[PDB]
Design a protein around this ligand. Sequence first.
Ligand SMILES: [Ca+2]
Ligand SMILES: [Ca+2]
Lengths: 52, 524, 80, 80
Amino acid sequence: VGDIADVQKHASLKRIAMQVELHTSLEKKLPLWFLRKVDQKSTIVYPNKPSL
Amino acid sequence: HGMTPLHLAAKNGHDKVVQLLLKKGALFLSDHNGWTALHHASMGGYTQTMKVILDTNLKCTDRLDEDGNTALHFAAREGHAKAVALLLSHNADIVLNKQQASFLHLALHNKRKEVVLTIIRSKRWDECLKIFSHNSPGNKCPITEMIEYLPECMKVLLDFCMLHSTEDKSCRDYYIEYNFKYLQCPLEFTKKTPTQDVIYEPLTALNAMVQNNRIELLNHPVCKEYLLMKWLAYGFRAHMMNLGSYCLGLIPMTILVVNIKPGMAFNSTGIINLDTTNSYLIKTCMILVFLSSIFGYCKEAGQIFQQKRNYFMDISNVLEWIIYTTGIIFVLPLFVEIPAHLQWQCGAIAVYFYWMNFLLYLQRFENCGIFIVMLEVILKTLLRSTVVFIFLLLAFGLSFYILLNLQDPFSSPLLSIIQTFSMMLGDINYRESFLEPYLRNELAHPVLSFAQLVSFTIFVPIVLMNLLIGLAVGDIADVQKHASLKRIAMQVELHTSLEKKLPLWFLRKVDQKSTIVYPNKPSL
Amino acid sequence: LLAFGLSFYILLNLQDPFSSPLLSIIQTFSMMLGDINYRESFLEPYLRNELAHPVLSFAQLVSFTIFVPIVLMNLLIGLA
Amino acid sequence: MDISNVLEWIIYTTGIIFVLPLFVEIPAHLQWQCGAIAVYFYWMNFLLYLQRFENCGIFIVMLEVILKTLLRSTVVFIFL
Ligand SMILES: [Ca+2]
Ligand SMILES: [Ca+2]
């Protein structure tokens, strides 16, 4: 119980941290010429077409 | 800056030079930003020069700046309670600015508690209450913004609504009159009432309370009397009629199932097996299910008429859909004959799902609804752990299917997962499925199966089960952090969902706008 | 309890732990603490074809094992 | 230093000698013995691959962190 409440204190951060660290572990081994082809640097999204 | 010396005197608050210049007259010029001298005195809050400047022609009392504010805004913006008392002693007009804000809004925005306490204690309160204008994103309503910003003066306002009007405490003629004039009908405040884009939902003051979680204001007595006014007028009546419709389906099923041996088939006249005993009982509940389940169709088909494409997002609707369609083909021997094994098979679907659905209808209660929302929120997080369950269960299930193939609890791969599912709760059949096979040399892989068992006993009944307990503890403590608010929020959102579909002519008949209660006659 | 009790009263009527509707609620009450008689009340009837509704009763059992010994029991632990 | 690598190592080496009768004949009791190692460890390893998800990965890290503290209590278990 004390272990799970420690994890769920940062549960919303831990999922995004695993998302970020996945890519940074992935792009470190990826060849750089492929990166320039695959990155697009900007995006266009149509919304309605489809503490103390 | 174009300021006259009268501006410069009233800016720094010196009454006598203001009194000296008024002996010779300074004509109340407007500077850049169009401020008058009364604006500067109202800015600093020097009431002493404000008293001396309100004894002349007072043509600056209604003067406006470049943004439309008068001097009443600036005193209310900078927190000078004695200033606004001095200004409201005279006939200060209440005109919005060009951002459509009255002086009450700026005090509510800048959180001047002692100022709005002097507004509420003084006279002229109702016309500055109604002075607000609609269709503006800020400056919505002085009641609702008082909820959103300053609950404690709003509490003091509620003490003015609660008057006893009878000094004899604990008397037979002792009474308490509550007024509900500040809790509803926001269009009834404005006397002009254009109602062009007026799309106000009911119970605006209460909805703002649960959205701004001011739980100390919900337990104020006039709010409880306002809820109990709505509850006793229609709210108990409709909730009885909704449940009583469903209870008229649920009880006649349960009477029908406990009086019939569950193998047999039945006409309306009795059991085939021919019993023909208490057929007057069996005929009337078999009808009463069939009539009620047809009403459930028109209840649901009426509900998809009110909501297209929002109906399908709920899980209760497909629950309610599976409720009725078996109850028809449970009692279908009223009309056409069906085989017996079919008739009970949908029956066990029905009576299981009836009470399981009936658990949902008591969620709209004040003393038992907090367990239903707790039962749902645990069930949601367990559903998110289904892929952890399936890959753990099917791992141990297939390995036990290999290792313990000679024993009939693992003869089938499908059966082995279910037996592993029954092994989850610590009911490991250690003796008659591991040990006695091992002492009879009936284990094909003895060293593996014991090692598989010990590794099973670590993971599933200990680690996986304490994970669900640890999930449920942190989940329940999250809910019970706002348990006292969640019950009242479900009370408020019930009525606002109910009054939106209710016809307005009925509302004028049923509302009474005030009540009389005799008490002794019946953070950091 | 009376939901799972009456459904087990229909599905497992041939076995004496569910012969009476009153008895079926009590056996469901004794089934609450994880003491599911899985072998001598589900499995051995199924391998002797003594279940009238085999696909339902296993589905009723799995849905029982979710709700009462896991969700309902952890709710009481989380309340306590 | 990883424990998943020796997990992944024990994944493949039995799956070869599970299907090894593609080439050479092995005794039957050996072939299923590594098979029960394989299919148990496959899905147990497959639990780790879904850790890289957005909606179910939070249970995997919770399942690991409970398992770490239980492993630290092994000497309390063994001597008891
Ligand atoms: Ca519905
Ligand atoms: Ca690896």
